[PDB]
Amino acid sequence: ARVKRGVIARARHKKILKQAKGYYGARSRVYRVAFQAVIKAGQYAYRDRRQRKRQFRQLWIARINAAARQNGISYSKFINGLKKASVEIDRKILADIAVFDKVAFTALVEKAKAALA
C-alpha cells in the first residue's frame, strides 16, 4: 500500500521553521541551515540555563561590594561580620535591598562591623 509523505514532511518543516524566526535570513527560511541553527540555539540555551546563576551571582557580588565600600568595609569583612553574627541572609536579598533602601543596609553593615571583633 503506497503511502505519500507530503503531509508529514510539510508539518515537520513548518514546526521546525516556526522555532527559527528571526535568524538573519537564510537560517530562518532554509531548512538545511535552520535545523542546525535551532539545534545550536538549543545547546546555547542549555548552557545559559546554568550560566545565568553565575552571572546574577557575580552581579550581586559587585553590587554588595560597591555598597559596602561606601560604608567603609570590604566585601570579605562584611561577609565575615554577617556570618559571625549568625545571619544567613543571602547576597541576592542584600543586593535587592541596597538599591530600594539604604538605612537597612547601613544597619546591616554597622552590625557586621560591631560583630566582626
Partner: peptide, 15 residues
C-alpha cells in the same frame, strides 16, 4: 522571617 521594615526596622539578630 528575615527582615521587618517600618519607620524603625527590626534587624534579625538571630535567624
Amino acid at each position: 522571617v528575615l527582615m521587618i521594615a517600618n519607620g524603625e526596622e527590626v534587624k534579625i539578630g538571630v535567624p
